[PDB]
Design a protein around this ligand. Structure first.
Ligand SMILES: *[C@@H]1O[C@H](CO[C@@H]2O[C@@H](C)[C@@H](O)[C@@H](O)[C@@H]2O)[C@@H](O[C@@H]2O[C@H](CO)[C@@H](O)[C@H](O)[C@H]2NC(C)=O)[C@H](O)[C@H]1NC(C)=O
Ligand SMILES: NC(=O)c1cc[n+](COC[n+]2ccccc2/C=N/O)cc1
Ligand SMILES: NC(=O)c1cc[n+](COC[n+]2ccccc2/C=N/O)cc1
Ligand SMILES: *[C@@H]1O[C@H](CO)[C@@H](O)[C@H](O)[C@H]1NC(C)=O
Ligand SMILES: *[C@@H]1O[C@H](CO)[C@@H](O)[C@H](O)[C@H]1NC(C)=O
Lengths: 529, 532
């Protein structure tokens, strides 16, 4: 009966749902099919556009979560289950979601497209912390998010083969972006103003769409939160991709011919691949994931590092940033002596052991270089500083310094870059205090979750959330987050960024400039000579 | 005749002189021969002990400076002329000096033995800054200093050969130490309480005597000022020692390699100055803080490298006093680093800094130089001229002095020796070097020898108090192995706490770590890099 909730897209008709916010209603269209279900013979294959349907597709609830591992480290703990699937798992998972103002915009409205993270092995557009109703209400944007295949289903690759070409999870994302170009106007969105934003592997995904020409024509601005395509975890070579796919087949009961092997893997229930996918990693590590985008000359014609250094980025505006303590979250999943249920006051021996799990597949000389830069040789063995130091090792090597490299190259090659460090610890944060501001805990403020009255955020946290939503939407609208004091662009020389917390904007210089000189300037030379 | 200035040593009778000092008289025996003159057939050979003499030998003035290069970069400039020869140059130079109180002490008195520095190519015991009269009058010590051969004459080596075995300049020092054991009691000195102290190459020499068993038995305490035997400039391997000796002989026409005795015999016929004029052409690169002829690790005087010996040594029963000046590196930058001069501010560019790293850290791989650039670059101010200037000074000083000294002090502390460490931080009011150089290499010496008490100088009243405090520290260490007053306390240096004291006009301040973060790079990481 509500025509505001009826939409006709290119494939057929949809019925949405009215959602309530403390500031009024918005229109949501959830579980829109954008691809043919990648099942049976379609497993590992690139996505196919959803064939047209008759009747009205019910778009009132989130659809299934793409098949993935479920974290079991702290069962029932808020800090971990908030990232676990909150819908049924299925390979029938290529659906996207649209939120618009209510009533629907009658003038073209800028579009934000969210790509979730989760190390390319997990994630879902349906998690509570990605709820788009508050952003859409407060800043009057059209917000789209899609599910994409993760783990082996999205990124297992036997390069050169047709049965498992790899990067199909990235092609899922691109297909959704194509869907947005063709259909977002039916919801009031403006296809000529599309801003990608993502976090962790989602930020790495955004960066890879920047570096892939078939994707570059489908959006106009980019936001990379706590992730970059040049991360040591975000891509894998062809030879290593083939090794992991081949080992997974072996652990699963399949041969050894690429054709016959993928055929046998197609016979296995999805849960069987999930349970063995972590046993193909070459060693004990943290912040490493089995099946990630592969550099094979197709989706990425070269390594992300090479494409970054060679790129002309005039006309590009980008928003990048990190949280205060990028590494702490990962240390509880493998670094000896760490746990959320203690102070994690590790010994020096545990620190040296943790450096090898935190910087895996490097020579001992490279590891010794790491322990040299991150040791205070006036307090070689103080547990508190050792714990803080290993957090810096994992955080700088995996997030901060890859992001700093990307920002510097883009700025020096024509792009307008804005950088931030998110330094507010949520009053509701369930992780212990020694983790500070962990990986991923700026998301809830950017989506305005503090506005939800059924949660215990403070009044200043609600104000803080509204300011962050204004920054992000300002950037989506104009390529500039400013409306104070002012947020200056990041440059390769001045290296200016702002701290995001409850205090007014504070401008600082250098994203861990000393530490990132080690990772980005020296250690590459050490590894190749 | 005065009975006070007549002494009989094992070789014959000596006549000395009574020196005036502001505090009072001291007895000086200057220019006592302890070796047969190492000239003619005795060039490059180990020193032979002085054969006994009849009559009285007048030890009344300093003897010749051992033949050596004369510095020419700033002619007439006081800051450089103070290190140049102040006596005639000669190969007949193996003489030592003994200062003793007046009247001579009734009971055996501890003995300080000075070994001058100068990169093993220069120096002399006659320099004004090594005048022992003020120390001996202030603290009633016996002070001995000796000349030793430098340059090719002291350290040219064709290892395995007998005509030029190498390290003969160290054996001159050893023979002087043997002379002290046999004769210092005749001047009132105690041969069971002998403290070696030296600066720069002299400090490196002191360290090598610690590491050489035939020398270790001739002294009991050591003081190493701004130098260490494990410094990258203080030794060479046998093969590079021979390469340089052969290259030197080739450039002066010898022979017209080959047999070693024939080549050395040809070298013995060359005028001493012609060897000096060519000894710098054998250096393998453009560098600073590298010297052509230095001690050689040949398995004799040094059974292994100083590092290996320091690590494998048991140092119980030994007390050591080590230290550095505040700006160890600046003095060397004006002798070859691009963009540096004493006459301007030396505010170098980024390119000059990178070029300076290669001359301050020579013979390292390109990757090794990259590691140096990474550690000493401030990546928030990568091109600030003043920062680059101080950074290159840090590079040269850390690599050559501070970190070698810190590696030595830490190992000996952890292996049974009682160590005391200092950083000398006072800039003399009379210093002639420009202000950007800070407290340069070697400018604590004049305060340790009490030169500010000289009537003819112009030090402030404070600097004379400061000199008297430092002389007391050194003599307290010589007497008891402990610089502290038997007043702010000076704690041992240990591998863990790494405590040292600052020496300036202020009272003693305790600090931790001798450039700990920097020296971790030089002493722990970079060796691993050069291996792989
Ligand atoms: C600072 O001076 C150095 C050295 O130049 C010397 O000192 C000058 C004051 C003047 O007396 C010169 O005659 C001296 O040679 C400069 O570096 C030299 O610059 C000259 C001229 O460009 C060049 O030919 C030499 O090769 C340079 N030598 C070195 C060691 O770099 C330096 O450029 C001056 N920097 C300033 C002006 O701040
Ligand atoms: N499919 C699996 O068996 C599996 C096992 C472990 N993990 C990783 O879960 C731990 N974890 C959870 C959250 C964030 C990071 C990490 C680990 N990083 O190295 C994924 C899949
Ligand atoms: N025999 C020579 O020609 C000669 C030339 C130069 N030097 C060294 O003089 C320069 N210098 C003088 C004082 C202190 C350091 C330095 C340089 N060190 O690399 C010695 C001998
Ligand atoms: C915090 O919020 C939770 C639900 O999110 C609620 O159960 C709890 O009572 C709240 N605590 C307060 C308001 O102190
Ligand atoms: C070198 O020459 C001398 C003199 O001719 C000769 O006695 C000796 O055997 C030769 N070999 C050596 C030892 O260098």
């Amino acid at each position: 009966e509500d025509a505001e909730l009826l939409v006709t897209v290119r494939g057929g008709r949809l019925r949405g749902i009215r959602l309530k916010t403390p500031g009024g209603p918005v229109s949501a269209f959830l579980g829109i099919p954008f691809a043919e279900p990648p099942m049976g013979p379609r497993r590992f294959l690139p996505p196919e556009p959803k064939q047209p349907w008759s009747g009205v597709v019910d778009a009132t609830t989130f659809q299934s979560v793409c098949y993935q591992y479920v974290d079991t480290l702290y069962p029932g703990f808020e800090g971990t289950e908030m990232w676990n699937p909150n819908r049924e798992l299925s390979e029938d998972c290529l659906y996207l979601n649209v939120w618009t103002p209510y009533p629907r915009p009658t003038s073209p409205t800028p579009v934000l497209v969210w790509i979730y993270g989760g190390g390319f092995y997990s994630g879902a557009s349906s998690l509570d912390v990605y709820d788009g109703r508050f952003l859409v209400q407060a800043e009057r944007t059209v917000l789209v998010s899609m599910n994409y295949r993760v783990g082996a289903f999205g990124f297992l690759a036997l390069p050169g083969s047709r049965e498992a070409p790899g990067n199909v999870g990235l092609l899922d994302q691109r297909l959704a972006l194509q869907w947005v170009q063709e259909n977002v106007a039916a919801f009031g969105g403006d296809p000529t103003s599309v801003t990608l934003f993502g976090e962790s592997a989602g930020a790495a995904s955004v960066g890879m769409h920047l570096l892939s020409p078939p994707s570059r024509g489908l959006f106009h601005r980019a936001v990379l939160q706590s992730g970059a395509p040049n991360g040591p975890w975000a891509t894998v070579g062809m030879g290593e991709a083939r090794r992991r796919a081949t080992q997974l087949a072996h652990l699963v009961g399949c041969p050894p011919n690429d054709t016959e092997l993928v055929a046998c893997l197609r016979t296995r229930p999805a849960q069987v691949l999930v349970n063995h996918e972590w046993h193909v990693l070459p060693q004990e590590s943290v912040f490493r994931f089995s099946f990630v985008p592969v550099v094979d000359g197709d989706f990425l014609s070269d390594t992300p590092e090479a494409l970054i250094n060679a790129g002309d980025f005039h006309g590009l505006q980008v928003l990048v940033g990190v949280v205060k303590d990028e590494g702490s979250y990962f240390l509880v999943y493998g670094a000896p002596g760490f746990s959320k249920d203690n102070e994690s006051l590790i010994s020096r021996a545990e620190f040296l052991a943790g450096v090898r799990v935190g910087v895996p597949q490097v020579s001992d000389l490279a590891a010794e270089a790491v322990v040299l830069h991150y040791t205070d040789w006036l307090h070689p063995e103080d547990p508190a500083r050792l714990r803080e130091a290993l957090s810096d090792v994992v955080g700088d090597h995996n997030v901060v310094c890859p992001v700093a490299q990307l920002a510097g190259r883009l700025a020096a090659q024509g792009a307008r870059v804005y950088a931030y460090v998110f330094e507010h610890r949520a009053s509701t944060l369930s992780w212990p205090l020694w983790m500070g501001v962990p990986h991923g805990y700026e998301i809830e403020f950017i989506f305005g979750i503090p506005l939800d009255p059924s949660r215990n955020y403070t009044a200043e946290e609600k104000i803080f959330a509204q300011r962050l939503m204004r920054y992000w939407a300002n950037f989506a609208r104009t390529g500039d987050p400013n409306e104070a004091p002012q947020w200056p662009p990041y440059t390769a020389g001045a290296q200016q960024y702002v701290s995001l917390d409850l205090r007014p904007l504070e401008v600082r210089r250098g994203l861990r400039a000393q530490a990132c000189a080690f990772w980005n300037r020296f250690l590459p030379k050490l590894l190749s000579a």
